Design an enzyme around this catalytic site. Sequence first.
Site, PDB file in Angstrom:
ATOM      1  N   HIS A  77       0.759  -1.235   0.000  1.00  0.00           N
ATOM      2  CA  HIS A  77       0.000   0.000   0.000  1.00  0.00           C
ATOM      3  C   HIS A  77       0.799   1.300   0.000  1.00  0.00           C
ATOM      4  CE1 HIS A  77      -4.265  -1.623   1.102  1.00  0.00           C
ATOM      5  NE2 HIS A  77      -3.625  -2.383   0.259  1.00  0.00           N
ATOM      6  N   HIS A 244      -0.890 -12.565  -2.301  1.00  0.00           N
ATOM      7  CA  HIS A 244      -1.948 -13.347  -1.680  1.00  0.00           C
ATOM      8  C   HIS A 244      -1.527 -14.788  -1.426  1.00  0.00           C
ATOM      9  CE1 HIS A 244      -5.203 -10.159  -2.845  1.00  0.00           C
ATOM     10  NE2 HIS A 244      -4.281  -9.689  -2.019  1.00  0.00           N
TER      11      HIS A 244
HETATM   12  C1  HEM Z   1      -6.078  -6.367  -7.451  1.00  0.00           C
HETATM   13  C2  HEM Z   1      -5.220  -6.046  -6.493  1.00  0.00           C
HETATM   14  C3  HEM Z   1      -5.474  -6.337  -5.059  1.00  0.00           C
HETATM   15  C4  HEM Z   1      -6.618  -6.288  -4.363  1.00  0.00           C
HETATM   16  C5  HEM Z   1      -8.022  -5.937  -4.861  1.00  0.00           C
HETATM   17  C6  HEM Z   1      -6.250  -6.610  -3.029  1.00  0.00           C
HETATM   18  C7  HEM Z   1      -7.148  -6.654  -1.955  1.00  0.00           C
HETATM   19  C8  HEM Z   1      -6.774  -6.896  -0.681  1.00  0.00           C
HETATM   20  C9  HEM Z   1      -7.703  -6.931   0.432  1.00  0.00           C
HETATM   21  C10 HEM Z   1      -9.116  -6.420   0.335  1.00  0.00           C
HETATM   22  C11 HEM Z   1      -7.022  -7.377   1.493  1.00  0.00           C
HETATM   23  C12 HEM Z   1      -7.601  -7.506   2.881  1.00  0.00           C
HETATM   24  C13 HEM Z   1      -7.409  -6.338   3.806  1.00  0.00           C
HETATM   25  C14 HEM Z   1      -7.970  -6.852   5.121  1.00  0.00           C
HETATM   26  O1  HEM Z   1      -9.205  -7.044   5.352  1.00  0.00           O
HETATM   27  O2  HEM Z   1      -7.085  -7.058   6.074  1.00  0.00           O
HETATM   28  C15 HEM Z   1      -5.711  -7.653   1.079  1.00  0.00           C
HETATM   29  C16 HEM Z   1      -4.726  -8.333   1.905  1.00  0.00           C
HETATM   30  C17 HEM Z   1      -3.442  -8.452   1.499  1.00  0.00           C
HETATM   31  N1  HEM Z   1      -2.914  -8.223   0.270  1.00  0.00           N
HETATM   32 FE1  HEM Z   1      -3.954  -7.678  -1.351  1.00  0.00          FE
HETATM   33  N2  HEM Z   1      -4.957  -6.983  -2.962  1.00  0.00           N
HETATM   34  C18 HEM Z   1      -4.421  -6.661  -4.146  1.00  0.00           C
HETATM   35  C19 HEM Z   1      -3.057  -6.786  -4.556  1.00  0.00           C
HETATM   36  C20 HEM Z   1      -2.040  -7.025  -3.593  1.00  0.00           C
HETATM   37  C21 HEM Z   1      -0.655  -6.997  -3.916  1.00  0.00           C
HETATM   38  C22 HEM Z   1      -0.108  -6.491  -5.217  1.00  0.00           C
HETATM   39  C23 HEM Z   1       0.037  -7.374  -2.803  1.00  0.00           C
HETATM   40  C24 HEM Z   1       1.494  -7.512  -2.579  1.00  0.00           C
HETATM   41  C25 HEM Z   1       2.406  -7.876  -3.450  1.00  0.00           C
HETATM   42  C26 HEM Z   1      -0.977  -7.708  -1.853  1.00  0.00           C
HETATM   43  C27 HEM Z   1      -0.680  -8.259  -0.680  1.00  0.00           C
HETATM   44  C28 HEM Z   1      -1.598  -8.491   0.379  1.00  0.00           C
HETATM   45  C29 HEM Z   1      -1.326  -9.274   1.565  1.00  0.00           C
HETATM   46  C30 HEM Z   1       0.001  -9.814   2.038  1.00  0.00           C
HETATM   47  C31 HEM Z   1      -2.484  -9.184   2.337  1.00  0.00           C
HETATM   48  C32 HEM Z   1      -2.796  -9.790   3.652  1.00  0.00           C
HETATM   49  C33 HEM Z   1      -2.800  -8.902   4.847  1.00  0.00           C
HETATM   50  C34 HEM Z   1      -2.660  -9.482   6.196  1.00  0.00           C
HETATM   51  O3  HEM Z   1      -2.351 -10.726   6.290  1.00  0.00           O
HETATM   52  O4  HEM Z   1      -3.039  -8.799   7.188  1.00  0.00           O
HETATM   53  N3  HEM Z   1      -2.284  -7.631  -2.454  1.00  0.00           N
HETATM   54  N4  HEM Z   1      -5.559  -7.565  -0.231  1.00  0.00           N
END
Ligand code: HEM
Lengths: 713, 713
Positions: A77, A244
């Site tokens: 982010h 993810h």
């Molecule tokens: C289309 C693009 C993406 C969408 C729509 C998206 C959406 C989100 C959402 C909604 C969450 C959950 C937030 C929550 O409720 O805690 C999240 C978690 C996360 N995303 Fe994405 N994401 C995107 C791309 C990315 C990218 C590019 C990365 C990193 C390279 C990323 C890494 C993460 C990780 C590691 C989590 C987990 C957070 C945790 O474990 O607390 N995502 N993502």
Amino acid sequence: GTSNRDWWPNQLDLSILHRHSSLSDPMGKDFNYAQAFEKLDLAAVKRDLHALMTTSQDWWPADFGHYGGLFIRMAWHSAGTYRTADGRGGAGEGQQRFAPLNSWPANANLDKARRLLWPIKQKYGRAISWADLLILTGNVALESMGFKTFGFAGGRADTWEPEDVYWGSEKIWLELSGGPNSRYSGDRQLENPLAAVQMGLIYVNPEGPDGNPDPVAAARDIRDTFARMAMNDEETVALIAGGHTFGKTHGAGPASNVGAEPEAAGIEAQGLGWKSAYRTGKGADAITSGLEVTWTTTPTQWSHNFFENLFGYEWELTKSPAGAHQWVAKGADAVIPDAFDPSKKHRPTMLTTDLSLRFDPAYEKISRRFHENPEQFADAFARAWFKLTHRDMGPRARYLGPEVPAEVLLWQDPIPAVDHPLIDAADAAELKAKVLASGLTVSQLVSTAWAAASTFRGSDKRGGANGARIRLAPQKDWEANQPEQLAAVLETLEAIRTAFNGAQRGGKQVSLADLIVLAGCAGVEQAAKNAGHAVTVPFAPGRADASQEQTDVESMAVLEPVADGFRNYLKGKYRVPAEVLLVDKAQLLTLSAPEMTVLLGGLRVLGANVGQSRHGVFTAREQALTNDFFVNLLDMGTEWKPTAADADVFEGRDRATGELKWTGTRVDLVFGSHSQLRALAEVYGSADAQEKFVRDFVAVWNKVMNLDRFDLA
Amino acid sequence: GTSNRDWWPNQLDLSILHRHSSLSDPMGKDFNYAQAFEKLDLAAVKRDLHALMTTSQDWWPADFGHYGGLFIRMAWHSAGTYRTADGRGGAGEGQQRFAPLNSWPANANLDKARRLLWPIKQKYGRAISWADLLILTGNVALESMGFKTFGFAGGRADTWEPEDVYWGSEKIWLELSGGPNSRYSGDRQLENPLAAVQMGLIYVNPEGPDGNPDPVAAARDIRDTFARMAMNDEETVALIAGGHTFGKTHGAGPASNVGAEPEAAGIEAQGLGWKSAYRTGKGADAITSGLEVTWTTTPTQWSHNFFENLFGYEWELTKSPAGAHQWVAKGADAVIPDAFDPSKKHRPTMLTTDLSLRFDPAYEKISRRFHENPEQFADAFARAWFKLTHRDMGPRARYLGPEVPAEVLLWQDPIPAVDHPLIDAADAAELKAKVLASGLTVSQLVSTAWAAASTFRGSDKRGGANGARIRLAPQKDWEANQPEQLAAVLETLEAIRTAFNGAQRGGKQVSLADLIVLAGCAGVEQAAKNAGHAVTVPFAPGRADASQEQTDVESMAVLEPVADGFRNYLKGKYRVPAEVLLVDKAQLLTLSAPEMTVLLGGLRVLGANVGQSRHGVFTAREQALTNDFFVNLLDMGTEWKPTAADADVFEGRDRATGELKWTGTRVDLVFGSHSQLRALAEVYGSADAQEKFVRDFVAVWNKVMNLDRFDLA
Ligand code: HEM
Ligand code: HEM
Ligand SMILES: [Cl-]
Ligand SMILES: [Cl-]
Ligand code: NA
Ligand code: NA
């Protein structure tokens, strides 16, 4: 308390140019972050970060006993606000810790993430910036969880107030498209310079476009926004599937339980927000996005399970406990661990936008390739993660520390190393005389050097005259650069270069990049001589020439000026008034209001306008460096009116006779209308100001010629 | 474009602190206006102004062939925005040329006046500021018309952006009282710090209160507003009758013919506004206020005809051609000249507010004395006019040029000249050691010096430690100053002073003003030594002691601090949050955000709090100069909650045990809540910051001690 903005909400705003003053900066005006960082014990920092991963704090307990997912999202982010259109956003200034980004919905609970980092920040102090720390923490999260990164550079200085970025015009967080301030028109066309689908999101809506859970249509949004962040299909699929692989989302109960975002919270919250009334408000009960998805069977370890799941099940539409649309694997067993209760397991789940990677036909081919060849996936995600997090750092010369990858990447707009002696002051004088003897005019010289150097933008530190990319595609064909005139100048300069270089020994040579800049300086000197003044323009050699094969043409497109008030140029007709565009360009060039003022008035009289337009050329001695623009602009003997043909062009007539004296655009006459700009104009249009004008012009000229010179930094 | 102010409109605004950056200032960082001014040929400037008074321009023809009236009003309005409550407004910064003042309805057509002075401004350039020029031009107007002024001082340096002043909360220009943002409550009580009756007026409504044409009620408004601009009844009568000896008002046709104010006007209007569609739109057809009154038979010559008319006729209510209420002389002959047609004459007319001078019984006595004794009227007016136009200039040391009046006036808070040798560096060291050996504590020494120096406000340059007025009425009895504690400290220092002065030879002596400051210096050094750090605090001698007889006690009242967050003090309960009041104080002290932050954190730990309050005293080594405030405030191990007794006091408890660690106010905890302030706090709370903290605190302390030292300027 009613303010000027309340009374005149459409007046031009100059405060964006007087940001980043030494007033708001706590560090001394001699503090140099680079030097502080070079002495940091980076290995030490990384050991403290590794420790922190599994040191759970009770006010925000670690999912699975491991903060790595949360920190990867934090880092993503931080970098993820980047827009190629203007270079604004990104991780490079640590802006996640200021408004508005610290309180964007999509940044919910990243406040907790940053607070977990305060002890390390505190311990190392000024030798590691927040900006660097947020990215380094993501890297260490990855490495802790088994993924080897491609590298890391320090050198992102912290900033001390919010940047003034246009994030959209909506007045409601997360507003869906088609409202009174819609960022979309036509066939789902996202307005430039935006790179997100809704106000307060990073790229797209995880439920699908305007909340419609269609993976195919979500894919379109994904491709468009990621392309507006400099990422192609391969990089996009690597990034989303790589991210993810780790961690989970948070949606344990209804969103109505979540309170005020940080900038809205009470003082007692001490900078945190989103306090939740749902159960314990944290850990197992956390509510962040409202979705409740855990992607893999090992959320704290690098694995190939993302694509095994995506392709190994069929998916059914369902709802989280907060009511959000998400997908669950039909007929699966409970194989996904719970974050807090070892006795609970869950079925595999996915977001809409995860499913995009399978149901969009172009992503599906990549996704299947990555599924079959996981080492290709790993390498791609490593390279894309590096790109993502360094995209706004500028030339490789700014990269600090022991983990900087040696590999030169095309997206870095690389400049070759210089391997020969540079020209000295005698050489520079000889070259300037050759240039003036060739016949090239002051206008052509100034114009060309301006065109070369003024591509720089401070937002992502791209552009500038280093590289001589003005001679390459696509810069050589940009309308603002006057391609036929430019070709004629470059042929003359290339011939001077060839002849100089051919006469040297000892290896000495001059680059075309340097010669373009030197020629510009010779123009400005000749212009001062035309005005009767002796002047010396400073010049620093050491630019090199990049090749066409080191110049990605599609990436270069976003630097094309479609408005450059410093050359009275507007490529077409825009919603935003031209004087707003001038201030935006001045901000990109790092100019203050007085610098913008002096620079424009001098370029007008030197002949820097595109197409030789007489608009703003308020002088009868064009090509002489004088303060004529300001003295004539401010003459009350002239009355101005808009033309019948064109409301954006103005004619200046003698008040007594009616006779036409000048014509001008909005960019020209705002200097005689805006009450702060006119005060600046008055200083340079005073009878005691001719030498001040010349001296200030030369200083700002030089500033512009050196904007990308981080090899001298 | 949606901004942070849109999303969080009640968050604290720090931008007022970082106005006046060297980014917005076109002059070089070494430019010194006094040095430019002292070489101006002021006599030459005044000759050009004299000539201008009768050189009409066709775009705004001169009434009666003479611009004198217009220029007097211009200068009166420049000075006339001044409020004693905060010292803001006034002529000293030339703010009439910027928003909002440049577009206030009461400033209509002063845009024309200022434009008429461009050619002179242009000719003399940086040697005469716009601020100085506006007032000089009013004086030259007066002199040209046969009035002998009391003198003139230059030295008002120009500013380059609008000041952030609270002018009221109305969202409509000229809104009548009793609206949703009314500036009136109770029995016609005008809210502090305002000094005008309607948004965009200078003092009062010339038709009468909220437009009711009752001279008696108007007089109440005149007295209250003029008192809030530091003028008593005699000065008020003298100013209004003096001004209205000259010129005329402008209301030749309906107000709906008048277009946009300058800040709203088109770019072609080149910074002018109020373009009128009524006939020729200017000269005989001009509309400014909508009133159409000419007060005297010789509008271009000083006279005593204003009072001759006021008292020699009875008055009838009537309407101007724009529909405004005004008064005409019953049964009079046409004796008043027309401004453009020598064949036309008019009956005497008056505003409702002019009639106030006869119908209010206290004004009537003064007005009759002035009528019978016009030489007393001329002297009063001349003295009032000097005060009005100089009231915000600060100490007499800042007054420049050959026309400064030698008479020292009580409203100047005058400081006696020093007539003896000053103490040297060894003397200062000897006195600091005497102060520390007396048994005065760090807290006493810091608190006393703070109390003395922190009365300064940069708005009108009043206050500060020079004078040692802390020992006099009323300062010695202000609650914030802890009167009994203060008396004990002063007695001890006066004994030190006596003993040192008695031992000298050669006339050398130390003033009490200097010794208060030096003793504070000794306190801060001793605090640093308590923390294990040897530092020397800079000290400059040369303050003098003023007498009680040289101190106007009623004028000094507005300098009392009723809110001083640097001592965690709030005299009572206010609508405005305490943090907002802190930032207002910091602005008055001329502090940046980093300076405010360091200063506050260090005062907390030195014991500067009023009443020895523990609020914000986040240290277990009080009276040691350390960064403990910041380290403890930022410790995530402590959780904060407002108390049940008082929502504005917070308890800090250990998060694990519940144990009470600290208490604080909003002023203390804002440094842990506001995103920009917390970022500042983090720098000083870092492990590497102890030396920095000390150095920066010493610097800001010395800055405060020296705020009124324009003798060293
Ligand atoms: C289309 C693009 C993406 C969408 C729509 C998206 C959406 C989100 C959402 C909604 C969450 C959950 C937030 C929550 O409720 O805690 C999240 C978690 C996360 N995303 Fe994405 N994401 C995107 C791309 C990315 C990218 C590019 C990365 C990193 C390279 C990323 C890494 C993460 C990780 C590691 C989590 C987990 C957070 C945790 O474990 O607390 N995502 N993502
Ligand atoms: C109760 C206080 C005051 C009231 C309500 C007031 C009202 C006004 C108004 C409404 C005008 C006409 C603007 C126009 O239509 O052109 C004006 C004109 C003028 N006022 Fe005042 N006035 C006040 C005090 C003062 C003071 C203190 C002075 C200076 C010492 C001053 C000097 C003048 C002059 C010289 C003009 C004539 C301008 C010209 O000839 O263009 N006034 N007054
Ligand atoms: Cl940004
Ligand atoms: Cl002000
Ligand atoms: Na950026
Ligand atoms: Na003021």
